[PDB]
Design a protein around this ligand. Structure first.
Ligand code: NI
Ligand code: NI
Ligand code: NI
Ligand code: NI
Ligand SMILES: [O-]
Ligand SMILES: [O-]
Lengths: 570, 100, 122, 570, 100, 100
């Protein structure tokens, strides 16, 4: 018995060599390998394979190699590969990637992926499955931002803020022990993973360090609090002792130094450079040169991603409104013109494509969109394919190399940068089961189902009064993982080792899973998956032209993007 | 009025349909959610009119054509489903391949 | 160059199911007056008593049909089906309680099947 | 002083011999008896009876025969009777049905129904009061389903699921110890009573039983997990040891047996047969014959209720869409035609009317409507009065016999079937105060107020910014019983005796009231109130015609129903 | 806009009224929630127009008649109440027996 | 439809704009939230039409004039901001001093 490839893909999802279009982009991913045994595919329903004595084992108790959940026939898109497998979850973690079912009667069953009495089933046939997005530039301004993030496949928010206070509206900072304690308690109600940044400012160690001991997961250095050589130095001395990451928004004004002064203060220590292009902040005009250095973990924020015909008009006005700048005050116009630069925004598209900028992030509600990190990653990759062609590394006419380079920017690389990649950031055995299912037609636009700690937290689903769940209106809705005390077991609060050792969770009555931040200080650009390029970036101080290896990096802005007006009601 | 949860939600469908119909009237090719809203509201208004489930399965295939919507939208919509109160109570309508 | 969002471009070729396993064709009759549909992965000897076939030829086997599909027998319908071999450990537990162990125990499976009135124990 | 009967009913609600129309149906209920003393009726407001030294006692502390709540002048509709009384609540339970007030000055006060300083008042004059509905076929797919259920007077949800996973979308199953623990924690946030079903599938006892010990309240056997003789047998062996109920969705495909094989596996043990007509699932075409047997507790699900001109067209298409069936594959069409049968749906209306099907249920979001169990019960009773006439048992021109037969189907009978009728399912002294107030014009359509454990949980109420609560928009809203920690005291989690003995509530930190499932294994059809008929049901395998006592059961589908377009905005 | 909770809720009344008015325009006899929505929106638009509470108590009795609504709807509606911002601030309007 | 949270919220803006436009059509001088709703919906419909951010910064200053609104409303509105999906993705429009 043979099945042609069209019929096979329609029934089980695609297999080896098959390609899938990502939404309405020009990007194609190809199945690299498949863990199945043809004829023994797992599936669930009437007369289907996962039934007692058949593909479901009726003998084994839960402890005996049985799963709590099997995702059947997933097309995984991850830094580790683009491939077809079943995904097995147990105790909220990914325990097996391979082939699930019943070793009684099936060949090729992964030994700890038994479908038993204890196993729930999610059908992933025809879906793309990715890790949950890791957003490391979150301003906590408006709690309505959490559902926005979940709807675009984001499962971890790292950043700071106390709500719509001016410090929080400008900076990813929860300042001091008391504000950190209050926001750790607030976090008990947020259905997403969270880590909190303290204020990376001070000239004495104790005021900074007491934030880490209070339960901060890292620090933010921001020019609005004084991005001085002293604040940079003390923050990195604290970070090196505490094993947490430091993010920086540098001195745009060059008030106490130029970029070379900020790099001298850093003194070779590991740092996460936020919005490294500089529209979102940093030494005018040359901050993006940070992305060449081996001790810098460089991210973009999303409103410059990718370079479009409305970008400059939008950004110049946004900057003038947000800074209360006057069109008739020449210092204000000079400042805006020094900060919003088509030359560095166009080069930023290309530096993403070359693997020189390693990460994406939002800048949610400060200068960025909580629900567009994943969206704009793929719009950038699509624009670069259309302007620069398939990368030299591609084969088979697929965009797999580009797809692994770009998926890494919002999954594994932020997790490595933050010291949380032991828990989240990729679809690997032993990591927390934060998984996003996508219909390919909606890939990177609207998540189908968001799994948090092995339970669905968020889903596009219809009328709750209907006979079945698909009738209109189909909209993003919080699911049972967010309800009651299950919100505690499905989400992680990431905290410093010192706050955990000092018992802060018990002191504050935190019931969430507690994740430990670690292995942040040892890493560098070389540890960024698919995005590990170091090079001398030259930014001309007169023309703002960007050069790498003697070549000007420039591209045109586009008039239209995929993943845009086909999908959105507004 | 005594609105129940479904009545409150389904007002949104009517509103989205009105928005989409204004966009169509000023000459735009409609997108995915616009097209879904128009066909969905049509089904629920048809039930209110006292049409049968069978009449609406037929009519729902003729509300929008290919040239009313953007490239790819016909192939994105495999079917549109709505529940509404017919004269004989709530029933489910599924319109298959509504836009050819 | 018309874009169908999320469309497949499948590779050339065909997928062979149950490759390398012995295939067996048998005739099967629904002697009952209600329809019987049989899934791809049920141990074939343990199907509905009113299906008449050589029950010995169902031992250690299942239908050679795509995973998750089924064969349908209308009332009184006789037709040929193709079986393939069970894999893995070749053990069956539960279902009709005819096996509860190795499929190699053919005499014990058939003795149980005959005592309980599974048609076609020969 | 005499009051004519029109004026009396307008002031105090109806009294003995008065009739009330149920919504816009042709059904009339008649007041059978009245506990009042004419002239000493309780009422609350300016210059009214329940004032200190008058109808309110000013002497007694709360412990001294004083109520926490008095519902004044209720028209009770219950399996126990259709009658007028005051209802007294204390400690969240119904403690008195009779006459409330002050024994100082009033005749006929029920001794434990004193209105005192501690007593709240709900005016029920002109309202019909029923027990909260008990829905025993709930798929936990979308948490928005809880308000849908409350708005139609449902107060208990029994079933299973983990959200919109395929196992849960098909089956009322929360599988295995870990998924059960996670959903018990989720339940802490759901403002409704809950019991969770485990997977009734396995060939070894231990994998099934460990679900009961983890906190499941029962099991579900579903053909999508293999409704085999082995799974049936093991599940009933577990249920008999654990004292919990088993629900079954049998082998529609007749794959491992016909109905007689499923009955042989059951072997005379008690079982709850879900959607017994079979459109919702079961041995094709004759599953409804289950409803004749003395060890079967038979329920309908609601989309076949009652038989209408759109039913078959709706159901055939729903089945084809949900099973991914093709109109051009003759096996698919044959399957659909074997499962959706006007002959068995028309007979199901009549079997309800004859007391042969004992229960209603939803099948919420799998093949049924979360908010239409009560609605469709009364539409069925109205259709049967219109087609079959008043039942022989009626007197006075009232429909009281039919009203007690039908109210039993969604109140007391599901509670008896599930082993929870010591706590819920009827308006009786000693049971939990889950009470639904209905305006007669909205009876069975939209609940006025839903009381959960003696506090209002849900109400149709208006503008929260207004001077008074009645201005538009009047909509269903969660009330203070759902807020903060009061959600714990107003709702019951029903669990197995073994999980309770093993301390599962303390292990998981459950704060809800814990109800014990018991006395499930001793009962049968004879224990179904007003619906206790056993008989030989014959289903012709060629024509699907249903016969009872040699007579074909058939009726016409109707073009219109009451409780429909007069009421609903969509 | 600075919408408060009441402003957000009361948009729903206007929307339900627009839905009901389209149903009436295509010849349907209106049901209970339709009739309530139309009369309620009329009151709130009247307040916006600067009518008095007394004018709206009068006018609200003439917005829909018996022959605009289904059997029984007139007897289901004993009164319709709305609060709206008059020129002199929020006031309550009750329309008694709006449909004779 | 697959509505995300922003799509669900922004339906409210369109609805408030429709309400305000009916008030303007029957001769009322518009208030603060009415004026904001009309200009906001205009921006989001303009993006849907495929106008540029620069075109909408210009046009948004000519949607309502002083004589369309109540005393003080022009001076209450320093700027109106909206995000919408342009052909090149979401962009922010700020209309400065929309009513002179
Ligand atoms: Ni910044
Ligand atoms: Ni920021
Ligand atoms: Ni079922
Ligand atoms: Ni069900
Ligand atoms: O930022
Ligand atoms: O079901």
């Amino acid at each position: 018995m043979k099945i042609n490839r069209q019929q096979y893909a329609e029934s089980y999802g695609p297999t080896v060599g098959d390609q899938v279009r990502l939404a309405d982009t020009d990007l194609w991913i190809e199945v690299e390998k498949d863990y199945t045994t043809y004829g023994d595919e797992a599936n669930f329903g009437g007369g289907k394979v996962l039934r007692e004595g058949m593909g479901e084992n009726g003998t084994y108790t839960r402890t005996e190699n049985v799963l709590d959940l099997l995702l059947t026939n997933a097309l995984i898109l991850d830094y580790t590969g683009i491939y077809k497998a079943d995904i097995g979850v147990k105790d909220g973690y990914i325990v097996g990637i391979g082939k699930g079912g019943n070793p009684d009667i099936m060949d090729g069953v992964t030994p700890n992926m038994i479908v038993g009495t204890a196993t729930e089933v999610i059908a992933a046939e025809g879906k793309i499955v990715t890790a949950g997005g890791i957003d490391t530039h979150v301003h906590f301004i408006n709690p309505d931002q959490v559902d926005v993030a979940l709807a675009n496949g984001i499962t971890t928010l790292f950043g700071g803020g106390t709500g719509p206070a001016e410090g929080s509206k400008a900076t990813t900072v929860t300042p001091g022990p008391w504000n950190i304690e209050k926001m750790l308690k607030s976090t008990e109600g947020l259905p997403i993973n969270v880590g909190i940044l303290g204020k990376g400012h001070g000239s004495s160690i104790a005021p900074i360090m007491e934030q880490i001991d209070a339960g901060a997961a890292g620090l933010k250095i921001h020019e609005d609090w004084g991005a001085t050589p002293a604040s940079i130095d003390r923050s990195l001395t604290v970070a090196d002792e505490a094993d947490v990451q430091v993010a920086i928004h540098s001195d745009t004004l060059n008030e106490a130094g130029f970029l070379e002064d900020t790099l001298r203060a850093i003194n070779g220590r590991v740092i996460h450079s936020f919005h490294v292009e500089g529209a979102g902040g940093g030494h005018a005009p040359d901050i993006m040169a940070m992305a060449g250095h081996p001790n810098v973990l460089p991210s973009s924020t999303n409103p410059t991603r990718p370079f479009t015909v409305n970008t400059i008009d939008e950004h110049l006005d946004m900057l003038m409104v947000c800074h209360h700048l006057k069109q008739n005050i020449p210092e204000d116009v000079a400042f805006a013109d020094s900060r919003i630069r088509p030359e560095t925004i166009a080069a930023e598209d290309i530096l993403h494509d070359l693997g020189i900028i390693s990460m994406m992030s939002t800048d949610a509600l400060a200068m960025g969109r909580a629900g567009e990190m994943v969206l704009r990653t793929w719009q950038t990759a699509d624009k670069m394919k259309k302007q620069r062609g398939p990368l030299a590394e591609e084969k088979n006419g697929s965009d797999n190399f580009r797809a692994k380079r770009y998926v890494s920017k919002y999954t594994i690389n932020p997790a490595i940068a933050q010291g949380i990649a032991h828990e989240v950031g990729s679809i690997e055995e032993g990591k927390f089961a934060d998984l996003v299912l996508w219909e390919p037609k909606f890939f990177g636009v609207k998540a189908d189902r968001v799994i948090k700690g092995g339970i669905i937290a968020y889903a596009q689903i219809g009328d709750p009064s209907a006979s079945i769940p698909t009738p209109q209106p189909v909209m993003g809705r919080r699911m049972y993982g967010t309800v009651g005390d299950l919100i505690h077991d499905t989400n992680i609060t990431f905290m410093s080792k010192s706050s955990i050792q000092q018992g802060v969770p018990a002191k504050l009555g935190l019931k969430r899973r507690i994740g430990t931040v670690k292995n942040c200080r040892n890493i560098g650009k070389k540890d960024m998956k698919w995005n590990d390029v170091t090079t001398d970036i030259d930014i001309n101080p007169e023309t703002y032209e960007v050069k790498v290896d003697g070549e000007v990096l420039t591209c045109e802005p586009v008039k239209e993007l995929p993943m845009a007006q086909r999908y959105f009601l507004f | 009025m005594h609105l129940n949860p479904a009545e409150k939600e389904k007002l949104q469908i009517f509103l989205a349909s009105e928005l989409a119909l204004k966009r169509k009237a000023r000459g735009l090719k409609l997108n995915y959610p616009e097209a879904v809203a128009i066909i969905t509201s049509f089904i629920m208004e048809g039930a209110r009119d006292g049409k049968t489930v069978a009449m609406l399965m037929e009519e729902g295939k003729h509300v929008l054509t290919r040239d009313d919507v953007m490239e790819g939208v016909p192939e994105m919509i495999d079917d549109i489903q709505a529940e509404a109160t017919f004269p004989d109570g709530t029933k489910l309508v599924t319109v298959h391949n509504p836009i050819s | 160059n018309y874009i169908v969002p999320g469309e497949y471009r499948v590779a050339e070729g065909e997928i062979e199911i149950n490759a390398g396993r012995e295939k067996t064709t048998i005739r099967v009759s629904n002697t009952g007056d209600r329809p019987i549909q049989v899934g791809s992965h049920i141990h074939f000897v343990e199907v509905n008593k009113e299906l008449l076939f050589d029950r010995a030829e169902g031992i250690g086997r299942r239908l050679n049909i795509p995973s998750g599909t089924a064969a349908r027998f209308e009332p009184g319908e006789e037709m040929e089906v193709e079986l393939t071999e069970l894999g893995g450990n070749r053990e069956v537990f539960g279902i009709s309680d005819l096996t509860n162990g190795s499929v190699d125990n053919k005499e014990l499976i058939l003795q149980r099947a005959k005592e309980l009135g599974y048609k076609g124990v020969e």
